[PDB]
């Protein structure tokens, strides 16, 4: 009957093992799989998952379990789950949990721990994981009372999925998950029934839209959630105000569904969105937090600033909103749309800025070897259609793809990377494929980022994941090298040796390719896409022109 | 003149870049190389190292920089150095720093950080690294004042190398290492001139040795340091008291130089050392901390307990020493040796226990496929001579090697692993080889542990490291599986797919081998040893008999 | 506007003015004396206290009444650490408090931020002079917004002394969605034993009118935690079931366990452990400014997050009919009426010496009318007053004390009086709690605060003694010596009163009330009957 009744499909049982209650709680959360590596302290949860519909997916390095979990979280909106053992099993997650928290990806990590009695000493894993995960999670707690077992797990998903999503860590002592517990599953509660910002405030902003002549919407992470899709589109059609998005909101609005989309901001200093922002007399931020794009780089201060989000702003020097609309975003945008009396008439400069953007949007006329980056971007465009997901690692290739991200027509793109973690592309792709295994996923990284997570190629083969991984090969850490060259005119620690990435992939049981010539790139990628399973393509790249592109950055 | 004079070979300069002072301080510490991966926030230290005798060694994953650094620290006694950039560059070190701290390996990690002005916000790397490293280091601090730059680095090496050694982390904001500083290098101070434990106390223990009839020495980490080698041997010869060692002291005393060595304790429940400890009426711990071997597993409480170490004991339930000798170990053992009036006369049981140990110390008469573990141990014994270093990863193979560690005659063995971190063997071997590049290093791991650090095979080829890596291949996480089988009679998350490890190694430019038959093992290892560079040998293993060996554990 | 400030302290003070700060409590020191100095050029009033802990107490009273954070200003080192207990008490009770604590120069860097984090909503140190106004503004925002709490800001000496470039930052939710209020209105109709459980936020002044309208159109019975002890009383709502959390014989507890629908307003599980009232056999509705802090025994079926006042008004508009009490509900409320009658006597205090507690309570009731504020310290007297809260007709009562800190009454009263100095404030404490903050009698005299302080004198820590007697039948560490509190109060320059006889307390309290300034009244009490009252506790 009630949510906390002692008689329901969620009965109050005498559980033989706390792990059984943990697994039942996961089922209530809608968890479909678990990523991680087992160990003695946590093997009972792995064991209990055998009697569950939840799928166990062993990875080869815990860090990639956190990466896969984040991809699951971003796509589905419900937290991806990592499951690791105590000690180095937990500490191997920290970078992944930070990357998830930075991007707003809901992730729950369940980490084993020594028996409670052994915490008062120095044993094989006397590791204070809560203290280590606290700085890089929304939520980190250890279950010290077996009664609070289901409560702690439920609160972890609640912290990860609600508000501005983030990562959550739960430490599970061995004796708690092995021993008996008395409790019940806590059914999952959705989002709060939040009200729109107050009418006196939305009318105030509506009056600013009329009085404004160069208004622009700045979309943040929360603007890209599905709950706000319909409301956001309805507001853009009735207002016709131009829009620009951070990379955490890179998918909220595409150029092909809204004519006045001004591109993505946060990376390049020559974007239509940037010019419209500095030109703007009214900026309305939707679902945006300053962390997504430092306000010091776009807020000139000569414009009225409106904040629309599920949480109050964290005021700062270059982000002191004059009006603050706090509440349900969808409800706020709907009420705001009701008070739009007329559609915007673009100013000459504003209109010219959008024209200049579309006029820009070389190429394939570049048979040089090694392949020029702009050529690789073109070949990627031809294979990444609306049915393919694209995951992008971190490096110089990342900047090239971001520069031409308007031209990719992918169903979804995972590229946003505030922490700038390398090695994310491949595990992101495996997680994304598991959500929609009927579709193709294309992951792209450098040779540096590739080897930090290439161990998961074995996981991809074992899963038969339909993932095509592209490696831009330069035998170095180029994105760092270019910075050293500009600053010091010499390189330090950015060069390493070559590899036979074709045979490397084949040793995992996957299909390997190596672009030997500029004419062989399209034939090779074409063949690699047609592979019904894991495939890797090594693409020698010539980064000589990188200094030209990097000068366009902030 | 004085250590802090403003006029000396360590002059007070106006440094153009804090990084220059950092590098000069490293030179004063005797640092020969630096392991890590560069980045924008820290690239000035990499740049400054170009003008230095210190060698830059790029790795492919930061975690392995911490592992290599630990090996350097254990062998030389001076801290190995890791150098990483901010954000995920630092968080990727945490597991390695914990493994170093647990084993007492001196390691200094220098991690980049955002500008000081950008710490008061959420930027690309607003990561509180000090809070994350504190639980797994002896020392973690961030340089906020450029004047304290050399002080902080000096104190990091001091914390790492002195007392019970450990890992230390220093966070270096970008503006501090890029901007100018005014300071001087701090010359390195050796160990304190400590005095022996008080005479009234050493005589008290000397009187206990006489009154004792089953005394035994329990050697800990500090007993294996070179400063105590001569004193320890002199005490064992004049006393002839039996000796047993933790694995952190596995090298302090070898069976071939002392007849009454009772093996290593901490892993197996059927060791001569264990029987002598439970039989003992007097246990003298030298350089030992309870963390090395839980006193609950060997201290029955029916024996007088003496503590000899550079630090006071941390009393606990099963470790309340009756006598406490605190001071310089070497000086304490020397004074104690002066008061030995006669050599011990072994008791019948004590003598019988040592006889039973030597009588034990199958084999090669096992042509079964896959190769029986005991056969692999024999083939390893034939190639690991006194000129070879042996590094051992974590897994079921680890238990087999530990069971027969008396039979290996290696110059040095790195096997101790309290945190039980997998992936340590290969990076340990690269670090060890760099200290003595004229010698051969043999590293052994499983297929699970191999892929967590196999990325460093590229580093080994690039370094031309004379490292032979052996993989016990079972296509699973066996050491975990055996625990699940005994506890639940079913497996969960411990199986993965096969790989062509021969071609895998060859893709890095290294020599690859695959033992196809039991008769080919010795021929293959023989050939792989004769390789003058990196080589990998895949060894299919049959773990069917593992349950028999694991029953001999605590 | 952006201004070129000569000293960071100038920007701090201007930011405080923008926040509406009327006074600052604290003690100056070298690291922070520039903020004290800058306050001379400000309309803000400097109120020196005699112990920093009491600055946090006074600040909390200002915060609770006005809704804008009270401000404490202390120097580095022990100046900050002396605040921790006060800041913890403010955070626990939901009182908005901003503490500005000095710190050594940045170049010379007690880790105060680490020490205040566990007992504050917000703790930060200003390391960049540019972010000075940002941090102060965010501190007030953290303290005053959402569920209010305490906030700490560490100000390095060089930051407030040196020049800064910045601007002042000038100083709001909508009602729950209509589709969600229609959902709740339908549940009230189908319900037959509904009850409101009021929490902290239901007691805020913004929700007073809306709450009354909801109770009038619904006539649903009400029970309150002690953080909401003032939102509703027995004399203004007939179906008030008392306050829950302290006594084991309250109508509110019985109605909650009987309820088939519980609507919590402004409530967090921390105010009253849900394990003691949520049986799980009822639909649970959560109405608050924040999402529910879910736990085992608190998984609401409906969650209304938004402006409480706007939500309750809209909900009251959709109530089609008034509740018809069930027999048990009516009987429970009847039993409370009979209980209140039994709690009353009337009795002629046969044991005149020492004065019986019930006699002191009546004498307090006669002087605490609707124009008087009452602050209550912690001790056995606290239980007595809590037992008879229904009978007090005070303008405001400060009694809620989850941390159970002693010494709060007097500084609470001084802070409360400063908000409305034209009214009388009555503070009551024990002899133990009195001496932990009695130093502020000098502040009261120096301020001419119209505060009447009552001391229940037993020469011991009674509330602990009674616990020891029940557990061990012997006392340990709960006895101390007597004091002549009349001369004690008079030595501060305040009026001192000593209840010499049982007939003189009302004459004395009457005379002490007629004092237009600080007054202290020592009241010898006979706690012999305490075991009878304490048996009524959980
Ligand atoms: C970072 C980290 N993450 C997780 C664990 C780990 N390190 N260490 C182990 C350990 C020692 O911790 C223990 C005993 O398995 C355990 O879980 O308690 S080793 C082990 C290594 C894989 O096995 P591998 O193939 O290499 O060896 P075989 O046994 O021969 O097959 C396993 C998965 N562990 C958990
Ligand atoms: C965990 C971690 N450790 C260290 C860094 C990292 N992640 N991210 C980068 C970054 C983005 O952080 C930045 C800009 O290079 C930097 O240092 O600031 S990416 C980069 C990845 C290697 O380059 P790769 O071969 O893959 O790509 P190419 O550029 O095409 O050659 C580099 C080494 N970084 C530092
Ligand atoms: C800071 C602090 N330090 C210590 C305690 C405290 N606060 N609070 C109390 C408390 C409520 O906490 C409890 C119930 O006594 C307890 O210990 O649990 S109050 C209480 C005050 C009783 O003495 P007092 O003379 O003031 O009142 P009478 O009862 O009339 O005599 C007692 C000393 N406490 C412990
Ligand atoms: Mg399953
Ligand atoms: Mg956190
Ligand atoms: Mg590269
Ligand atoms: Mg060099
Ligand atoms: Mg530490
Ligand atoms: Mg294996
Ligand atoms: Mg209030
Ligand atoms: Mg806090
Ligand atoms: Mg008292």
UniProtKB/Swiss-Prot annotation, chain C:
EC numbers: 2.2.1.6
Keywords assigned: FAD, Flavoprotein, Magnesium, Metal-binding, Thiamine pyrophosphate, Transferase
Catalytic activity annotation: 2 pyruvate + H(+) = (2S)-2-acetolactate + CO2
GO molecular function: acetolactate synthase activity; flavin adenine dinucleotide binding; magnesium ion binding; thiamine pyrophosphate binding
Gene Ontology process terms (BP): butanediol metabolic process; isoleucine biosynthetic process; L-valine biosynthetic process
Functional pathway: Polyol metabolism; (R,R)-butane-2,3-diol biosynthesis; (R,R)-butane-2,3-diol from pyruvate: step 1/3
Keyword hit for Transferase: yes
SUPFAM superfamilies, per database record: DHS-like NAD/FAD-binding domain (SSF52467), Thiamin diphosphate-binding fold (THDP-binding) (SSF52518)
UniProt-listed CDD domains: TPP_ALS, TPP_PYR_POX_like
Keyword Flavoprotein: yes
Record's GO cellular component terms: acetolactate synthase complex
Binding positions for FAD per the UniProt entry: 147, 247-268, 288-307
Additional record remark: Does not seem to require thiamine pyrophosphate. Valine resistant.
Protein name: Acetolactate synthase, catabolic
